[PDB]
């Protein structure tokens, strides 16, 4: 008893954002967005001054947490134990924190029944870097979005140029590249693609054919 799926996982600034809100679009599909979860969590942990250093502080917050997602209007905003947060979790900070947030062991794993539910008729997209190697180990389909550092890099620090803020490539270069270094020695939530994960390159491919590209890929199998 279970439905359909999609894994569209990779990087940050691989654009699997955009992504996904045209596999949930063109499909109607459930759009499971998962790096938000951890972005509120940390928001959580951060107003409830949690220590978000120490696991042993992060799989309570997890395990009993208020996080839930609109419906279809505008976009998509996140709500937190009672009040909306979008704009908020989408800080410059409280990602450090969701870095932190979300590289321990147990928390994952508080987070994981609580994503594992996402699943309902008709499918479920979900954006992430382990929709696959964890959470959808059964999906049939499997994505891998990923784009170089240099590129990541522009994918945001200019993203935000024109979002009223300031930033310096060199910089965010430097702290993508740690996070990869990082993501990648890892452990536990690598973000290496599903053993039977398509991997897709998106550096001078264009989103209007990343959405052609994957979507092949998804009624395909
Ligand atoms: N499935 C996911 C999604 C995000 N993350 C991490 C990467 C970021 O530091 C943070 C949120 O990522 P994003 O900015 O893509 O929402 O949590 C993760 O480890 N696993």
Known sequence: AIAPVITIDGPSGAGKGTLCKAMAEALQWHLLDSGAIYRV????????????????ALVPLASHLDVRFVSTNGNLEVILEGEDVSG????QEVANAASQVAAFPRVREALLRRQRAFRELPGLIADGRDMGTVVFPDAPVKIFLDASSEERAHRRMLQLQEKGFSVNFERLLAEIKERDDRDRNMAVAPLVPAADALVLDSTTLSIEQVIEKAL???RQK
């Open 41 to 56: 969590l940390a928001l959580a942990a951060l107003h409830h001054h949690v220590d978000v250093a120490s696991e042993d």
């Open 88 to 91: 908020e979790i989408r800080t």
């Open 216 to 218: 092949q890929y998804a």
